[PDB]
Design a protein around this nucleic acid. Structure first.
Lengths: 107, 99, 84, 94, 97, 78, 104, 92
DNA sequence: ATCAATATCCACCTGCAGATTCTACCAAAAGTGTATTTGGAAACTGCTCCATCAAAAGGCATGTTCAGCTGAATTCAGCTGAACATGCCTTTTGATGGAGCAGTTTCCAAATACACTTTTGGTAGAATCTGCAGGTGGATATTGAT
DNA sequence: ATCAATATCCACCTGCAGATTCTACCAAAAGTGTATTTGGAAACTGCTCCATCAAAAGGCATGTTCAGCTGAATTCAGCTGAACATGCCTTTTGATGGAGCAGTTTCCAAATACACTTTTGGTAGAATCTGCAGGTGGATATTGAT
């Protein structure tokens, strides 16, 4: 019989197989990893990647450019209440969200 | 005239200028040299991948900029506009970097 | 090679101002520049000391960007975009 | 020779999917890779612990599901759970 | 009759309460609140007595710590009264916001 | 129910925290903060309960939830 | 003849090794001496806290160490305070009032 | 039934302070303490081996993990205790 | 500050009960001894990639001046938040009996790890493609003097 | 007001640094088939959890009175921003040598995996005993006031 990738079998773009392997080389000791744990896991990584790329891409549109740069990722992430909370990492290249307090503004 | 911008006008231009850009703000060579002085005083005869020195500058600037925002909130709260070392110590204490 | 000293002053008054500009700071008292340099050295030390501990444990002589990335994660200052 | 695995292929695929016109610079792709590995670790981290607290040698889709409820906030969690349940059921059916 | 100047009994309470270690929220009102809150996530739940006790401990720790930071923001503004704008600032530098 | 967390009690807490004079608006403010705190901790605890198919939130479920919010607590099983 | 006794420690080297196996990873192998080293360290740190805590109970004139003492030992030591940002339940806080609040 | 470090904590108490006893609430804190540090060390040591593509957690990982976790004087003395316990164990 | 009178606090003893410590045996693990198994040491070696050097040019750091406006005093009164002695309702606490339900079991299917033998999907450089960095120039603000 | 004087735009423009696509073995994902657990699934069994009751004793809520704090206003010394002149030292373009990382092997020391034999650590009663929380009475600290 002919090979069908587990990714395909799951309707996913992310690599179920490679993720299953990465999961085995983690935990615990006599740690078993279920068949579907890899599939469920690929689905969320893929979903989250989609959610971030969607927002970054809109950013680069508002800026009249074709290519997503780290700035764009930073705007997308800081802009979204959900993602800003999930991702309190530091985006290299990011910059900050332009913002100035009122009491500094010229009276 | 000769033309002078009033105090605080060029400051606001620079805030906008720099919040818009994303390039590193500290000069590359002096910083690398500082990273070497510090590692030197920890373990002699050490080398650095170029991107290792870069990772450090990214993180430090990220750090200092983030700190100045907190420092700046302490300043406004004290009903000022000028940041002082007194503010930095308050920001840093509350973050529990010195407690 | 050549003795390295006083490199903390390599972080000029002008560079610190730019950083405070991105921080959205409008007026800066004169005592900040020396306060800042001191905060930065405490930060840089802690991170470099950890990176080097990862370097020595791997019996390498070269601090890798991976070492710095792990060192930063230890301290909860995760960096994206150097992880290779 | 010697080769590092990446996620760039799959990030690039998902990208075409959402914004078929848009491209991603190299540095930006590098961040997305850090982003994926990061999350993957948090999930596996949490799922590992969950299994430990319940005397369970194995990690199942049910762990991964709880791991995701604990890590993702609000609306992100709800959509992620659907997407993963969906993929899991469609995987067992197929 | 005998009156104490404002701030005097206040300082005795600080000294008194920084000395003891009991919980300072009443036990039953607290438990009632915990259950009411938990009812919105799962229904008909039982709690171990020690779990209610962990919450109240984690919780009073938390609030006390935060009052310290709030007080520091207040002193920084040359006041002595804490106001909610001090709690806000404190919670913000902490990244809880 | 949140109002059952009384003004005097909140005054006691502040006192331990080193507070000498308290504004009248702090009381309402604190309740809201304390409610966000318990909401976040319980939600995690109950998530750990359900996964265990239990109906009883244990002290370990709470310790675990707390450890996740980076508010580690010693004295209840870890 | 027990490993703890062999290694010179009160702490249980054997139970620690079995704890380390069920950690990491899927091909996890655990060295003989890692169990000992780990055990040596938990015992050292335990000795260090209990030392200071005992001091805090003698200076308060009591025989039994309570959580209050553990809190005072820990917060009063720069290094232990740095390493333990947990919450000691029933620990209280270090008494301390800011100057500007003291009544002149 | 639950393993505890209660026994071994009490033993250590009598060595440093044979006069003092320990209440149960406080004994529960020492438990939390030992578990926490154990988890922190163990976690760091695996990560270490993982970064360096290894499978076995040797005392070399535990020692480095300690350098990384403990603040300084605490790290010296703990390393001392460590290398002390490990040599004496391999002599006998 | 002494001269008052409240009221707080601090030491020194005091007596039981609620916890602590000390005592009594049954298993789940810790300690052996044997037989593989395996990983990560040691040893060459190919070859990125890091330290160093040179050199020229211009982007920036530095130092001075000069004065605008900010922070830090100081004074004021309105009014908020402390103290308090009053009044009662809701928390505490302590058995009590009933029961939900965590936590042990003792099984068999479902699910999972192995262990081989094809069979692709990905990766590392090649080969092509092109967004956009960084340069210009006048609309269009934005500021600040009069 | 309304002009200067500069700063900020926003567009159009082009070759190249940096993407997107083009090929070529290799590790690894996928197909089997067989060996082994797992974590479920009923069935109970104690054990803590909720729900009563039913009081006294706090501890909270309430209304007064006013001290004293915060905030508003006013003033001014001088700190810090802006601009300008000056010229250093960072940046950027190459090359070179060689340190040292990383890819291969070959393989003893060290680790696992049994399979038993002993030992300890966890329970659950037994046996003290620490200190809680309660007296007295003796200075202390606080606040009114010659």
């Amino acid at each position: 019989a002919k090979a069908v990738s587990r990714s395909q079998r799951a309707g996913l773009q992310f690599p179920v197989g490679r993720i299953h392997r990465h999961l085995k080389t983690r935990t615990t000791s006599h740690g078993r990893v279920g068949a579907t744990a890899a599939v469920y896991s690929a689905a969320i990584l893929e979903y989250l990647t989609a959610e971030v790329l969607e927002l970054a891409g809109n950013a680069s549109k508002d800026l009249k450019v074709k290519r997503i740069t780290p700035r764009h990722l930073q705007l997308a992430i800081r802009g979204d209440e959900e993602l800003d909370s999930l991702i309190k990492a530091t985006i290299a290249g990011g910059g900050v969200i332009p913002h100035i307090h009122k009491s500094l503004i010229g009276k | 005239k000769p033309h002078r911008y009033r105090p605080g006008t060029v400051a606001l231009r620079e805030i906008r200028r720099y919040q818009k850009s994303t390039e590193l703000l500290i000069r590359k060579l002096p910083f690398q040299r500082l990273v070497r002085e510090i590692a030197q005083d920890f373990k002699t005869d050490l080398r650095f991948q170029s991107s290792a020195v870069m990772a450090l500058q990214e993180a430090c600037e990220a750090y200092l900029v983030g700190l100045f925002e907190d420092t700046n909130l302490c300043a406004i709260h004290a009903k000022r506009v000028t940041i002082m070392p007194k503010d930095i110590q308050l920001a840093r204490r509350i973050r529990g970097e010195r407690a | 090679r050549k003795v390295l000293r006083d490199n903390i002053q390599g972080i000029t008054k002008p560079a610190i101002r730019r950083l405070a500009r991105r921080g959205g700071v409008k007026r800066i008292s004169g005592l900040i520049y020396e306060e800042t340099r001191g905060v930065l050295k405490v930060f840089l030390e802690n991170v470099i000391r950890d990176a080097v501990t990862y370097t020595e444990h791997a019996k390498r002589k070269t601090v890798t960007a991976m070492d710095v990335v792990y060192a930063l994660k230890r301290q909860g200052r995760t960096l994206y975009g150097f992880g290779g | 020779r010697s080769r590092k695995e990446s996620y760039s292929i799959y990030v690039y695929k998902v990208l075409k999917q959402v914004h078929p016109d848009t491209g991603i610079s190299s540095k930006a792709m590098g961040i997305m890779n850090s982003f994926v590995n990061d999350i993957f670790e948090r999930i596996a981290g949490e799922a590992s612990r969950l299994a430990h607290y319940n005397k369970r040698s194995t990690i199942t889709s049910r762990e991964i599901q709880t791991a995701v409820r604990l890590l993702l906030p609000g609306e992100l969690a709800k959509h992620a759970v659907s997407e993963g349940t969906k993929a899991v059921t469609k995987y067992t059916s197929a």
